[PDB]
Amino acid sequence: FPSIPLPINGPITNKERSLAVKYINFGKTVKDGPF
Amino acid sequence: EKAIPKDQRATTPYMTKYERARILGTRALQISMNAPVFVDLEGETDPLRIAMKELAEKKIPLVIRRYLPDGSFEDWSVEELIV
Amino acid sequence: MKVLEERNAFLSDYEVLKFLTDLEKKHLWDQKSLAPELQGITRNVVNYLSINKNFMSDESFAELMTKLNSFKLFKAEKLQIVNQLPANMVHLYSIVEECDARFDEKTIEEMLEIISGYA
Amino acid sequence: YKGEVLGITRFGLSKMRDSVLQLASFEKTTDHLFDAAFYMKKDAVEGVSECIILGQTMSIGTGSFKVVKGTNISEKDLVPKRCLFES
Amino acid sequence: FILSKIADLVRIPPDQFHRDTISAITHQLNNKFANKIIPNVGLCITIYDLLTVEEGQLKPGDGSSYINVTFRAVVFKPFLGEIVTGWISKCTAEGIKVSLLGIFDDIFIPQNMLFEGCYYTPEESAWIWPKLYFDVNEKIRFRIEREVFVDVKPKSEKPPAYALLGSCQTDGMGLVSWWE
Amino acid sequence: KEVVVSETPKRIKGLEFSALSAADIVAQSEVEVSTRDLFDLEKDRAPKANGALDPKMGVSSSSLECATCHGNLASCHGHFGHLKLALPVFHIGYFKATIQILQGICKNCSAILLSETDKRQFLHELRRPGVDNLRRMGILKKILDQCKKQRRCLHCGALNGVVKKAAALKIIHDTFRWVGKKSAPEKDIWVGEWKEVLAHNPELERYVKRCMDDLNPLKTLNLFKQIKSADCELLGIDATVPSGRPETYIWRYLPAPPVCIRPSVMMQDSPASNEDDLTVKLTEIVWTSSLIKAGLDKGISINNMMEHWDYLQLTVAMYINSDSVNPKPIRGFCQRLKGKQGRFRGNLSGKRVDFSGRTVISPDPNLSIDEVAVPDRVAKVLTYPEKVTRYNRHKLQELIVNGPNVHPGANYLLKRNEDARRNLRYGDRMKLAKNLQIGDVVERHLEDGDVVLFNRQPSLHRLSILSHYAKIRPWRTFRLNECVCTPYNADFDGDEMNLHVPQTEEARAEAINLMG
Amino acid sequence: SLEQRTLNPDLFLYKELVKAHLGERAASVIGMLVALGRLSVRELVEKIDGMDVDSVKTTLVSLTQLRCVKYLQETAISGKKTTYYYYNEEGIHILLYSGLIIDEIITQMRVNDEEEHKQLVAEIVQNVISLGSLTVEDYLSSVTSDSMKYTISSLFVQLCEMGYLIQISKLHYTPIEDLWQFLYEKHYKNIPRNSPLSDLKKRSQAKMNAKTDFAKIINKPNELSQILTVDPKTSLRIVKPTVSLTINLDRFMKGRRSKQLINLAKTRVGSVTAQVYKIALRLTEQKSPKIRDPLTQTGLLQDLEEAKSFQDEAELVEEKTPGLTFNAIDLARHLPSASLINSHLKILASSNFPFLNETKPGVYYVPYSKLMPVLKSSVYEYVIASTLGPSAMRLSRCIRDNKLVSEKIINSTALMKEKDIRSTLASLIRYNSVEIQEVPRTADRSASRAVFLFRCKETHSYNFMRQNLEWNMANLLFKKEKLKQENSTLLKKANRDDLLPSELNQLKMVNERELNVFARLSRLLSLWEVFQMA
Amino acid sequence: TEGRSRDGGLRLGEMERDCVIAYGASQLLLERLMISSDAFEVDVCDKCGLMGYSGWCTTCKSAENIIKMTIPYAAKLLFQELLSMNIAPRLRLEDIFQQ
Amino acid sequence: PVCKNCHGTEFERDLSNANNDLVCKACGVVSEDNPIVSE
Ligand SMILES: [Zn+2]
Ligand SMILES: [Zn+2]
Ligand SMILES: [Zn+2]
Ligand SMILES: [Zn+2]
């Protein structure tokens, strides 16, 4: 319903798909931690 | 802030002007909803007039719970009141 | 509408007949006036469990409960096996687990004659 | 009774009692409504002139006390049917 | 066959003032709690006793007597492993409609704990067996694992209020006449 | 179903007011009124497409049906519609309170004009338990005195002067308070931009001391939305509710009231319906907002649309309170809650009621005090509900067989299972007399023994009303005993008084023992 | 999603980010703190509903360890001591930026190649801040007795003494305004009675002494001479082992700032000079002017005679600091030729973008106090040129140099057709990049007898879109955990094994779509972080 | 409706509301201002308390927390046109019993 | 238009007793009382 997106809508590159790995295991570290 | 027994009873023992409009007010609705009355009625109608006759023998099966303004109880059986 | 607690205690299946037997008493000559909704449900309970018991005094019920619950702590299942296929040990094998490797004594033969003596 | 002698005008009624359904029942109506929800006020319904329009049992007069029925029972038959719990 | 400490208030019509209190509070709670389900508890049958009762209050618009009380009643919660012999009244092509005859019939129990030759044969049979068949109106032994409780009404039959889970994992399951 | 249903009767402890959010409007509305025109030229009876007297919004007639809830007029409680404004406007009720919310805060960084160790002292006076409304707004007077006496802000150092009305209904901020030092980083940039435009069209120098930067309803929403929630309680509004943010106090969406509030009255001089004042005020704003929304999309002049956006700003402030016309005046919301019996005296404090009557008075000595005499032609209209019991079963059976043409009779009855009423002038009575289930209620006429209230209409004091017994006489006028005339100060010169009759049993008892 | 898009400031970001990977009991407590400001635990209890008094303290000590809030104590004279609790602005940024801390360590530290701690130094950054505060003895007591611990212990002095691993204390852990309070009256009570003259000048005595100390107190954690232990046996250089430390974002934010400038370099110059500009900046990343500027955060920012003094000395810090003014003879050896490093640096002075602009002949240094507003003016304009037409880029720049333009001269300065600009300019009114100035020809602001002037208004024009991205940072990760609410029956199974064939596919389609999220979260993170240079 | 040809019905005024209140009466004042004249049946919600129709809340579309009461029609109609401008009469409910 | 028990189709507005109700001749059950006139 709303138009005009941001210009950053692109296929993920191999420069940062390894960087996206470091997020999800960081959340699995802390949430499976003490708290 | 709870029930108050007979010893620490510190208000009037008197059945006030607003009591006999409410007790008689709520009794006639019970009569009109087919609750059985206790007194020796003759042929009467008019469920109010059967109530204020039955008040004269002091056989109301009720009890008034007066409130102190601090949210505390105070109880008085309707036979213990005098008019 | 407040539920304070759900599982206060248990109640044995004799009182399911016994307390309901007195409920069958003061209900205007049940089952024999053929010549509300609460009546029809409350008779469907009493007949279903009694046929299982058929196909008595409460004292003789009581001492065979004392002999049975010889467990250390894991006993509570003695309440549910009171009328469920009497005189059958392969029935009792599939009810409680880890008893085929613990009841290798003369207990499990002694428990059989109590249940068949109840029959 | 609130520290200073004050009239019975608009300016006076704003300083005695602050119950916004009663003040709207007075002369200037909407000027006490918008600024009530602007500050997000909160009043219980205990005065008489707002128990009228909500339509509830009035707090005063013969609406002070309540009517309680005798229950003609004591503890003499309030024991359970406790029998044969676990053995 | 267990008790549950619950509390609720109950009204009294004025024409039951002539009858005594304990029978009156039992009667009006019976037809409220006769053949009813309880949210997240189970199926209440009949009021057992009366623990403690307060004083009767009155609503001024109605004029009847309204009373609150605490009491426990009987409710059928066997166990999560209870052996029981029910009956049957229906057979379906993906499971089996085994429910206790006499009381309630809102039960669908599957067969997910049995062997590898289990399907439907439309010849009044369950399936073809690798053995005495079983049919309507006879004692059929089945157990219980779980139950599902939902109390949501999406206003705009499969009644989902009180449905049990059953299986027939061991031998002798499907008919009680296979043993004894 | 086999499921228990149980509820207790409940009460209302007290109201709390709030402004509902800009997102809850579409949450509680369910239709939308984008289009304009009220009646389609289909030549149908109820021609309404989407944005009109909409049949799934409500129904303003007796012969149609509400397509949302259901029912014609007995059942439909009405439903709200919502609009969508093109670009925001001010709220005329909050217009007094939308400038107190701005005099405290910075016009550049949108922070409150306080120091840190000073603001912590103030809201301490909010947190103590003993606070009533009279001093809670008392300390809110001091919090806006302290801010406007402080010239420059705390986060970007920007200048901040004063802001007030422009005596339309827009507000302007004077950021110019120089004392004797004009060497300010605000002032040098102000002249630095201004001589650039004086190069061209240089006729404009006589306006400059008048001209001043404004705060339109678009940038004030962007100024309110910038602010943090931490300083909210210091200037009146609080957090912990979804609608507590202070951007909701100006319009962005407005709700449409259900059509029972604005009934389509037919004057019955012509087969066209004369619609009330309130629809065409809401109708003309969806036309202005639609052509503004089309105006920026195709492209229209900024010197043209700024008065079209001034128009609905002036127009929506008339839908609420019609005193801001700056002048056959249209009736508004604020024009009917207040005033000479609009609401709160003519419909909510003092109401209009059923079961009354009104004739003139004439004296009579021969009847006792407490005994008002009621004529019979009014006495077989004013009925009284009365339940059936074994104490009075033998009377009601003889009374119901009389019927409503002889005097001691009834008019209506309710059996237990039926739900509406039973008319007694129609159908068979004697067969209906025979059943008379014991839990039922009939409506007998007034007879000698019931309870009648009676008062003069100009009521001086508390004792101008009092209640009497009734007894029926075959003449036509009200008669009372003479000794009670001195409270009524009657004078028998053509005045008339009314009579009342309660219709419960607990009011029948209370009227005697307190007003006999 | 209209419920959320309307009544939610940055609180909609802060509430869910601690709700993302941390317990749910603590997401509601700091939502109460940010909403209501500051409060004690004693009256925290009735603001929330459903958390017991001790259950707050267990929840609050759970949130304390990650350094996500900041307490402060004041006592009553007749009363006991009370402890207020604030919200920490940058501690919650750490678990926001937590993915990007990992990728910078490898990129700043290129001295090692195919090391056996590639797994471990990325684990150590995940091991220094995930548990919260951390000291030396807590990681040698792991399962590894030695496993060359002396290499790994001495690895950190290379990794800590470059910065951004400063010993933790109470200084950065208590707020700055309240830190500025109790040192102000102490120097105000250092001067007693009987110094009578110029009472309005005697307030400056504590005020000038505050600035000298307030720089020294913030330098105490920056003081690196007290985090060393030169061990005379078995070692050459090691940190003090009894030191509790965490990450410090101050170098990281400056390092992220230098990551932003090289992109602006690669746009305004080709490939050869962009490689030159990156090398010289890395040498001066460890000591730079502060990006947060805590001295301008709070204080006497009201009056212009001091508000100008917050950048007069701050500029004078930048050019007169010995640790960055490079002589352009050091740079030729660090690249993997004294004429070329003059020639490629000569054009940095020629361009009108003031980086390496002004200098003393022979030395060179880049300024920041007159640079990053051109960076703020750079990333702002092209985003407008992306989200709508490039004609809107043309109208924006026409109002930049020409201030307060009317509707006749826009056709004289720029040149497009007349009907098309109004279908473009009005789009820029709606987003608060252009403004309205009104001039009345008649009395009482009569709308028809008026023309309408414009302005840039450089301060409102950024603050709109910064919250338009903070909400956009907050909107997309709501679809992260909401996506985890469905398909929850198998992620519990996928966390249990450590295998149905058809169910494995719907674990992949919920995997590459959230893989797109963190890439789309990173790209607008850089477009946002430029608006923190205040 | 006012008017003899409009089939009448009397206006019980505002100082007549002042005339009853001095008698201390608290029951026939309620019936003559709600029951005999203007009685109306409203089902209202508990949480986020504003009105709803026959079986819903239509702002939290759950239709569970519904508590039936009765109020005058002149009190319902205030609670809608006052909601037409942007102020909300949020209702809050207690039970009568267990004082 | 259709009664609730005997399903009659004719309704006769009685206007003698100032009620102006709606009721059929067959059985005597009212359809809708309290008429709503548009003033
Ligand atoms: Zn509807
Ligand atoms: Zn500012
Ligand atoms: Zn609700
Ligand atoms: Zn009929």
UniProtKB/Swiss-Prot annotation, chain A:
The acidic domain is essential for its function. Disulfide bonds: none annotated. It is found in: Nucleus. It comes from Saccharomyces cerevisiae (strain ATCC 204508 / S288c). Belongs to the eukaryotic RPC7 RNA polymerase subunit family. This is DNA-directed RNA polymerase III subunit RPC7. Component of the RNA polymerase III (Pol III) complex consisting of 17 subunits. DNA-dependent RNA polymerase catalyzes the transcription of DNA into RNA using the four ribonucleoside triphosphates as substrates. Specific peripheric component of RNA polymerase III which synthesizes small RNAs, such as 5S rRNA and tRNAs. C31 is involved in the formation of the initiation complex. The chain holds residues 36 to 70 of 251 of the full protein. Coiled coil: none annotated. Transmembrane segments: none annotated.
From Swiss-Prot, chain E:
Keywords: DNA-directed RNA polymerase, Nucleus, Phosphoprotein, Transcription. Its main location: nucleus. One of its GO terms (cellular component) is nucleus. The keyword Hydrolase does not apply. Coiled coil: none annotated. One of its GO terms (biological process) is transcription by RNA polymerase III. Belongs to the eukaryotic RPB7/RPC8 RNA polymerase subunit family. Present with 752 molecules/cell in log phase SD medium. This is DNA-directed RNA polymerase III subunit RPC8.
From Swiss-Prot, chain F:
Zn(2+) 2 binds at residues 106, 109, 153. Changing residue 486 to I: Temperature-sensitive. Mg(2+) binds at residues 491, 493, 495. It comes from the Eukaryota. Zn(2+) 1 binds at residues 66, 69, 76, 79. It is found in: Nucleus. Belongs to the RNA polymerase beta' chain family. Component of the RNA polymerase III (Pol III) complex consisting of 17 subunits. DNA-dependent RNA polymerase catalyzes the transcription of DNA into RNA using the four ribonucleoside triphosphates as substrates. Largest and catalytic core component of RNA polymerase III which synthesizes small RNAs, such as 5S rRNA and tRNAs. Forms the polymerase active center together with the second largest subunit. A single-stranded DNA template strand of the promoter is positioned within the central active site cleft of Pol III. Present with 6020 molecules/cell in log phase SD medium. This is DNA-directed RNA polymerase III subunit RPC1. It comes from Saccharomyces cerevisiae (strain ATCC 204508 / S288c). The gene is RPO31.
From Swiss-Prot, chain H:
A zinc finger (C4-type) spans 45-60. It is found in: Nucleus. Zn(2+) binds at residues 45, 48, 57, 60. DNA-dependent RNA polymerase catalyzes the transcription of DNA into RNA using the four ribonucleoside triphosphates as substrates. Second largest core component of RNA polymerase III which synthesizes small RNAs, such as 5S rRNA and tRNAs. Proposed to contribute to the polymerase catalytic activity and forms the polymerase active center together with the largest subunit. Pol III is composed of mobile elements and RPC2 is part of the core element with the central large cleft and probably a clamp element that moves to open and close the cleft. Present with 1950 molecules/cell in log phase SD medium. Component of the RNA polymerase III (Pol III) complex consisting of 17 subunits. Belongs to the RNA polymerase beta chain family. This is DNA-directed RNA polymerase III subunit RPC2. It comes from Saccharomyces cerevisiae (strain ATCC 204508 / S288c) (Baker's yeast). The chain holds residues 1051 to 1149 of 1149 of the full protein.
